[PDB]
Symmetry: C2
Subunit: 232 residues, 2 copies
């Protein structure tokens, strides 16, 4: 059955971002039959990332996931068809917890584990101020392989269109639930794929990322999109 | 005597960012007689910011600093002459702890409490990619009133210039220690000051920020720089 994973990087219990994220979830579940896993720092524990690049990419070792909810969160992410990530926009950047969520899955940076998944982002600002949060979330999740289905940026100054914005996001999601949209890569993703291929190909046979690419047959494919449909 | 506050948003003890920040501190101390306070997530406790904008800005309510090291950090920042902020560049953004440090002093967003202080930023990327971390740190600390004295962005490439970069930062810092450089505002800061004045002007007579501006005489000044020199 259609599975949606939602993570809201919120720490303020009176969070407006949380309110809008719950509203979006409610709209989706009321109109469609789907399995939603809604996670936040209030119902999940993700210790602050303390990984080392060397061990992480070279050996693929995660010293924290088996200590908190990192393991279950990663599992739900991979099992999901649609991923919704929401973050407050405080001081023109993502929240501490949103950055932590991203760092905790940083070990997947060069593995395209989100390929085939549709990502919807929601960022909420209480004073606007021209930020590039939506662009940042787009870059991170697309580089990880996800297709950026839709992005919603809400502002308190334009809170009157928030409802319309959430309904629009729901419409985009329904297209996926109804099978009207299929996973397609962007040029940004294909270039990242070709770039990583050349680099990893030269790595040692014992390198974790290289072994992963060989096991998943990422080297043989002609493109990331082809790889997804031909072998995945 | 002269005081320097340093905060490195690092979670891994083998952090290259920590190594370079310690190196910069060592260089300065080996050439100058100053009081340096070096803080990190290892020796300082800063719970993830959970503030609510309404309560924070309208009533000045902060339910965290008097629970951890936030209070002492704020005190040291205000008594310091120079502030050094360092952050690893992971996933093209500041670290979780650097964003947290920034959010924990977010209550000062519209108060220019860093006016008169000189800020040096250090960001370190273990990969040679693209990011706007230095620009982000510049904007945040400048808006808070600090003068961006110098910025160092270290990147792991074929040409190692890290040492030269840190020495260059040391020379800038020494010019302040010797009193050769005095606090001067930028157009960006003066524009922010005039913009805020008009906004807070219409706020409620009991609004925490409006009252700060009234009691501090920020309203009866012609510019932020004038305010600093006439009052402070």
């Amino acid at each position: 059955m259609n599975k949606i994973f939602i993570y809201a990087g919120v720490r303020n219990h009176n969070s407006k971002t949380l309110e809008y994220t719950k509203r979006l979830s409610s709209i989706i579940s009321s109109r469609n039959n789907v399995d939603i896993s809604f996670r936040t720092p209030f119902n999940s524990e993700l210790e602050i990332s303390n990984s080392d690049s060397e061990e992480l990419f070279k050996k693929g070792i995660d010293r924290q996931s088996n200590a908190d909810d990192g393991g279950v969160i990663k599992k739900e992410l991979l099992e999901s068809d649609i991923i919704i990530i929401s973050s407050p926009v405080y001081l023109q950047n993502v929240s501490v917890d949103t950055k932590n969520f991203i760092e905790r899955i940083g070990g997947w940076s060069h593995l395209f584990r989100l390929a085939g998944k549709f990502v919807v982002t929601l960022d909420v600002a209480e004073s606007n101020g021209s930020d590039n949060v939506s662009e940042y979330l787009r870059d991170i999740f697309s580089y990880m392989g996800g297709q950026i289905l839709h992005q919603v940026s809400i502002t308190n100054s334009l809170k009157d269109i928030a409802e319309a914005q959430l309904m629009e996001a729901t419409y985009k999601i329904e297209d996926v639930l109804e099978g009207k949209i299929k996973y397609k890569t962007t040029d940004y993703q294909e270039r990242a794929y070709q770039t990583l291929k050349l680099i990893l190909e030269n790595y040692d046979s014992e390198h974790f990322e290289k072994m992963y690419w060989e096991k998943k047959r990422l080297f043989e494919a002609n493109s990331l999109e082809e790889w997804y449909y031909v072998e995945n």
